[PDB]
Amino acid sequence: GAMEGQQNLAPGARCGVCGDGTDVLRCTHCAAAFHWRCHFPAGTSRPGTGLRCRSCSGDVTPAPVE
Ligand SMILES: [Zn+2]
Ligand SMILES: [Zn+2]
Numbered sequence: 001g002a003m004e005g006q007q008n009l010a011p012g013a014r015c016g017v018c019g020d021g022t023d024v025l026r027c028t029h030c031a032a033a034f035h036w037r038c039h040f041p042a043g044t045s046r047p048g049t050g051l052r053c054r055s056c057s058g059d060v061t062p063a064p065v066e
Contacts, residue, residue: 008021010024010026010033013032014033015033015034015035017034023035026051027056028050028051029053029056030056036051039053039054040054040057
């Protein structure tokens with residue numbers, strides 16, 4: 001219906017900065033739960049192409065495919 005996301009509170013996965021897991025973002029390269037602004041408060045823009053946590057955003061160098 002419209003209440004399948006009622007328990008959006010990930011088990012053992014919440015924004016450590018807030019304590020809440022309400023509308024918490026997930027990492028695509030690993031498993032994580034955080035709010036973008038809570039991890040990247042430097043004015044970093046949230047990418048729609050691959051949500052990346054702090055660790056996964058450390059080294060991001062793609063392989064030049066020709
Ligand atoms: Zn937060
Ligand atoms: Zn990650």
